[PDB]
Amino acid sequence: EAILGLTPCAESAKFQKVLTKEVKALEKREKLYEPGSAPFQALEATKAKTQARFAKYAESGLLCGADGLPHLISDPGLAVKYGHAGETLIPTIGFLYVAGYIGTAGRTYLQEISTRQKPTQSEIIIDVPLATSIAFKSWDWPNKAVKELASGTLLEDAKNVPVSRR
Amino acid sequence: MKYFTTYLSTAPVVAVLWFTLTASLLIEINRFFPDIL
Amino acid sequence: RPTWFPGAEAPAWLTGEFPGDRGFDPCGLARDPVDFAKFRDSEVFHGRWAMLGLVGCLVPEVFGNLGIAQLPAWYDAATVANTSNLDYLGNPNLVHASNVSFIALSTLLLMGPVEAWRWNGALASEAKSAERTTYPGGPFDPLKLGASPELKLKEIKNGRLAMVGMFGFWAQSYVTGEGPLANLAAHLADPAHNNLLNT
Amino acid sequence: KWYGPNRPKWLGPLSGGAVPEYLKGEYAGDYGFDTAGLAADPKLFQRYRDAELQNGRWAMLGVLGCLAPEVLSNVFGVPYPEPVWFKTGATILNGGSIDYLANPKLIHASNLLLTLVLELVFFFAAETWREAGEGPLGKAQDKSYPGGVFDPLGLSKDPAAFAEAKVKEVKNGRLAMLAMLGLFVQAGVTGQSPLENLSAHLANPGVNFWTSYAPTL
Amino acid sequence: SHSVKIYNTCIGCTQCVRACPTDVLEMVPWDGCKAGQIASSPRTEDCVGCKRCESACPTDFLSVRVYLGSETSRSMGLAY
Amino acid sequence: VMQAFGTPEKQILIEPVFAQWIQSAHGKNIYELNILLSSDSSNAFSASQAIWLPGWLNGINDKSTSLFLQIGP
Amino acid sequence: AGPARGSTVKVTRPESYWYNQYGKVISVDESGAIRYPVVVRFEKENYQGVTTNNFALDELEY
Ligand code: CLA
Ligand SMILES: CC1=C(C#C/C(C)=C/C=C/C(C)=C/C=C/C=C(C)/C=C/C=C(C)/C=C/[C@@]23O[C@]2(C)C[C@@H](O)CC3(C)C)C(C)(C)C[C@H](O)C1
Ligand SMILES: CC1=C(C#C/C(C)=C/C=C/C(C)=C/C=C/C=C(C)/C=C/C=C(C)/C=C/[C@@]23O[C@]2(C)C[C@@H](O)CC3(C)C)C(C)(C)C[C@H](O)C1
Numbered sequence: 001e002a003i004l005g006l007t008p009c010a011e012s013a014k015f016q017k018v019l020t021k022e023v024k025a026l027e028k029r030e031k032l033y034e035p036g037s038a039p040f041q042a043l044e045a046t047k048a049k050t051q052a053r054f055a056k057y058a059e060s061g062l063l064c065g066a067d068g069l070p071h072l073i074s075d076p077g078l079a080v081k082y083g084h085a086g087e088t089l090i091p092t093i094g095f096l097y098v099a100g101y102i103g104t105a106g107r108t109y110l111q112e113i114s115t116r117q118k119p120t121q122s123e124i125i126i127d128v129p130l131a132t133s134i135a136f137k138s139w140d141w142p143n144k145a146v147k148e149l150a151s152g153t154l155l156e157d158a159k160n161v162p163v164s165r166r
Numbered sequence: 167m168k169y170f171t172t173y174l175s176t177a178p179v180v181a182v183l184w185f186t187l188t189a190s191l192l193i194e195i196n197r198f199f200p201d202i203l
Numbered sequence: 204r205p206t207w208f209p210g211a212e213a214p215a216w217l218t219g220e221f222p223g224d225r226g227f228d229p230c231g232l233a234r235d236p237v238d239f240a241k242f243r244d245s246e247v248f249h250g251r252w253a254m255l256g257l258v259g260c261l262v263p264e265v266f267g268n269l270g271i272a273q274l275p276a277w278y279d280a281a282t283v284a285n286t287s288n289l290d291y292l293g294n295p296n297l298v299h300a301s302n303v304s305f306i307a308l309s310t311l312l313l314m315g316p317v318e319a320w321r322w323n324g325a326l327a328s329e330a331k332s333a334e335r336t337t338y339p340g341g342p343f344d345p346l347k348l349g350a351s352p353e354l355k356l357k358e359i360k361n362g363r364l365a366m367v368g369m370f371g372f373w374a375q376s377y378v379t380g381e382g383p384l385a386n387l388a389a390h391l392a393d394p395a396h397n398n399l400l401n402t
Numbered sequence: 403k404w405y406g407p408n409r410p411k412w413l414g415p416l417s418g419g420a421v422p423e424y425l426k427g428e429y430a431g432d433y434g435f436d437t438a439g440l441a442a443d444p445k446l447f448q449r450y451r452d453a454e455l456q457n458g459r460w461a462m463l464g465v466l467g468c469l470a471p472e473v474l475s476n477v478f479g480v481p482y483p484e485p486v487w488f489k490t491g492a493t494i495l496n497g498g499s500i501d502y503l504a505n506p507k508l509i510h511a512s513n514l515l516l517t518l519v520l521e522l523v524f525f526f527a528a529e530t531w532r533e534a535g536e537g538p539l540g541k542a543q544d545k546s547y548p549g550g551v552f553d554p555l556g557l558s559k560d561p562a563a564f565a566e567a568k569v570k571e572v573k574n575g576r577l578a579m580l581a582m583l584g585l586f587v588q589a590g591v592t593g594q595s596p597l598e599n600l601s602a603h604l605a606n607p608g609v610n611f612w613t614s615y616a617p618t619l
Numbered sequence: 620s621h622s623v624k625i626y627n628t629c630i631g632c633t634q635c636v637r638a639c640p641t642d643v644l645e646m647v648p649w650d651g652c653k654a655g656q657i658a659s660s661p662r663t664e665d666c667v668g669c670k671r672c673e674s675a676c677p678t679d680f681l682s683v684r685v686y687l688g689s690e691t692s693r694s695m696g697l698a699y
Numbered sequence: 700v701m702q703a704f705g706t707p708e709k710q711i712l713i714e715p716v717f718a719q720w721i722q723s724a725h726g727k728n729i730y731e732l733n734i735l736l737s738s739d740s741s742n743a744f745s746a747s748q749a750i751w752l753p754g755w756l757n758g759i760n761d762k763s764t765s766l767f768l769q770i771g772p
Numbered sequence: 773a774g775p776a777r778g779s780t781v782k783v784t785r786p787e788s789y790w791y792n793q794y795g796k797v798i799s800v801d802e803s804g805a806i807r808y809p810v811v812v813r814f815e816k817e818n819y820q821g822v823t824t825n826n827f828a829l830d831e832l833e834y
């Protein structure tokens with residue numbers, strides 16, 4: 001469905017122009033080699049991939065501009081109403097899960113070693129068992145996050161936080 | 167080997183190893199499932 | 204004590220000193236006794252605006268049917284003022300207002316002082332005390348009668364009814380697409396097949 | 403059905419060595435079943451207890467909500483567009499609306515993302531109050547068993563009846579969880595409604611089984 | 620000239636005095652600390668402003684403090 | 700790197716939809732969004748004593764003027 | 773009163789690196805002439821690279 005003045009890539013002539021332009025370049029390169037030789041095969045693999053890629057973009061409801069290149073929709077309302085949520089909105093959730101995981105693993109390891117005798121030695125020599133255990137137990141990180149938040153164990157109190165003369 | 171694993175546990179070795187695996191994984195995904203936009 | 208539900212036990216903070224108490228506060232919004240006095244004013248205030256708003260919304264339909272004037276419908280007046288002129292009681296020489304933004308500005312400019320004065324407890328720029336007014340008297344009570352707890356309960360009760368009524372008017376107008384008395388007429392005609400649950 | 407050291411157990415009469423030590427019959431639904439040792443840490447055991455009750459109660463409302471609009475369409479003539487549970491949802495897609503009791507003057511909802519966002523926001527509030535154990539609706543008596551507004555009939559006032567009813571709740575919960583897991587797998591395998599699945603096994607006890615689908619794998 | 624001031628947090632370690640390259644500071648007797656000596660700055664006309672003393676001082680926010688001011692040929696470190 | 704490897708179709712080209720919405724509300728009809736001044740039926744458009752609007756809309760939908768330039772990635 | 777040797781204090785001197793932080797008491801001086809009698813040791817070194825400092829009683833919370 002054409003929105004925001006954009007055409008769907010599946011029914012855009014400029015899209016086809018682009019595909020033609022890439023495939024023609026590859027043909028020109030192929031002229032130099034012999035139809036059985038291994039460079040030839042490489043250029044054929046390249047061309048195959050190329051045509052496949054354009055076909056994929058065509059059956060994905062991507063939206064082309066005047067340049068004939070696909071454009072992404074980032075307002076979540078527009079994305080969900082017109083079937084474009086896979087462009088930005090799903091990746092959002094995907095990034096925020098993995099970033100929360102990495103944070104949780106890092107915070108966890110740091111809070112664990114902080115109770116050791118020399119905690120700074122465990123920062124330059126990683127406790128690898130401890131780190132692997134933390135990395136694999138941290139797949140359900142919102143458990144820990146919402147617990148820490150609602151309980152109050154997420155934030156240090158202001159009285160315990162070093163601060164300047166203000 | 168008696169302290170070789172502790173050497174492998176040091177930060178730049180663990181970093182090189184972890185990035186190498188993480189990079190390798192992303193390369194292999196981008197071999198199998200290319201051109202995700 | 205009379206309560207909103209058979210046998211239902213009242214909160215601790217709802218004791219029965221104030222008119223309209225039926226021990227109704229599931230969401231615990233009047234735990235803080237400082238907020239409870241504000242809410243009490245807000246309840247009566249919302250009530251009085253709902254009563255005036257209900258009467259003022261029935262008036263176009265009634266005045267239409269009794270052959271007094273062809274007033275716009277309550278959900279049409281802003282459209283009328285926006286596209287054409289709003290002439291009082293039909294009469295094109297009365298008021299004859301044409302611009303919705305000047306109506307809105309006027310509404311803020313007239314209701315600003317009045318609202319501040321109400322809150323401040325006097326015609327002054329600073330509140331007299333930490334207490335809400337809600338029952339002024341003086342010029343606002345010309346017939347010299349009132350502020351009895353029975354009458355207060357009568358106000359509260361009619362208010363609450365009108366606020367539920369006003370919610371009705373909004374939803375009705377959206378759904379049925381016609382005026383409120385028309386909706387009553389429709390239900391009074393054939394009640395089994397002119398209602399919400401029949402489609 | 404009971405508590406204590408001589409309660410019903412999960413291997414019945416043959417349940418001598420089948421009980422771990424940390425399950426001493428203090429909490430509802432202790433049949434001494436924990437073969438993977440998940441509850442050996444007692445903080446983890448408190449967590450899991452809350453989780454088993456959250457999954458259970460949600461599973462109960464779920465199974466009732468997956469069956470009820472199909473039943474209403476079957477028994478009564480309520481004209482739901484796609485009344486099956488795994489087909490509901492798609493009704494709000496395209497240009498279609500969601501009308502409660504198939505009446506287009508009831509919710510008439512057409513904006514999927516507005517629906518979802520309202521749900522997440524409401525839940526972010528209510529779940530944060532749940533986890534804290536204090537909120538607008540009051541302070542909880544126990545994290546899993548709040549009481550107050552949540553118990554308006556006062557059925558938790560009697561101690562012994564409360565102790566029994568905890569065992570009723572956890573056992574209905576477990577059943578409902580197995581029901582819901584049933585619904586999911588049935589839809590995944592048979593592709594038909596779960597009332598049609600029941601009708602098919604009521605009509606014919608025989609071949610109409612999981613062992614009509616098993617040969618195809 | 621620069622101005623060098625000594626505050627009462629001094630612990631009389633003598634490190635600033637040792638550090639100074641133009642003999643501005645000396646240790647005089649005092650009773651405010653266990654070492655029974657404080658630093659002092661009599662010859663501030665000879666201070667070049669290097670702040671070596673403040674680098675030497677071990678108290679938390681220094682007890683010796685150099686406030687740079689007006690330049691002279693002495694403070695500007697000129698051999699011409 | 701997409702341009703360098705000869706694959707301009709794999710660029711990330713996010714549309715500025717929030718600025719295009721604002722432009723649509725001001726009266727630009729190039730984004731087919733039909734709101735406020737770009738809808739004929741709105742209160743904002745049909746405000747009787749508007750009267751600056753014909754001039755304004757002529758201006759905002761003329762490529763020569765720089766009155767709200769068209770925008771993209 | 774003084775803190776006990778070995779006890780934990782919180783610094784309340786605003787110009788200090790260790791403000792709002794906790795240290796161990798190592799020594800208290802008993803003379804009244806001394807202006808900063810309490811010696812405190814911290815785990816985190818300051819910008820100078822030292823880990824110890826003298827304090828008065830009115831700069832500690834014990
Ligand atoms: C446990 C690791 C961890 C966590 C949970 C955080 C969390 C945060 N950082 Mg910090 N930070 C970290 C490490 C961490 N950081 C490191 C290692 C550096 C040095 C490069 C920084 C440098 C830094 C700066 C300059 C800023 C932040 C800021 C922030 C805050 C906002 C988010 C952000 O800006 O991310 C950005 C994160 C980075 C730029 C650093 C990348 C962190 C890596 C990818 C993850 C940790 C790596 C670690 C080695 C994992 C080992 C775990 C294993 C042994 C189990 C957030 C509180 C910002 C802030 O103050 O917000 C108010 C801010 O300006 N961080
Ligand atoms: C108390 C409580 C709770 C509650 C509650 C509930 C149910 C609250 C509900 C409140 C509700 C339902 C409040 C309505 C207001 C209506 C008003 C003010 C209308 C004015 C309307 C006016 C002034 C209209 C004016 C005009 O129409 C006129 C006259 C002519 C038209 O041409 C023009 C316009 C339209 C401008 C909880 C949350 C359940 C639990 C908690 O623990 C305790
Ligand atoms: C105890 C134990 C063990 C165990 C175990 C076991 C057997 C665990 C099993 C857990 C299981 C099976 C848990 C399912 C929950 C399902 C839920 C929450 C369903 C909700 C459903 C809801 C809320 C929603 C339903 C709907 O949205 C749907 C779907 C579609 C919509 O159209 C309609 C509605 C909105 C109504 C081990 C591991 C074996 C050994 C160890 O040692 C000890």
Ligand code: SF4
Binds near residue numbers: 623669
């Ligand atoms: S600044 Fe340099 S010259 Fe001056 S007192 Fe300090 S050490 Fe001595």
Ligand code: SF4
Binds near residue numbers: 628631683
């Ligand atoms: S000023 Fe600092 S460096 Fe100089 S003696 Fe005193 S404590 Fe030691």
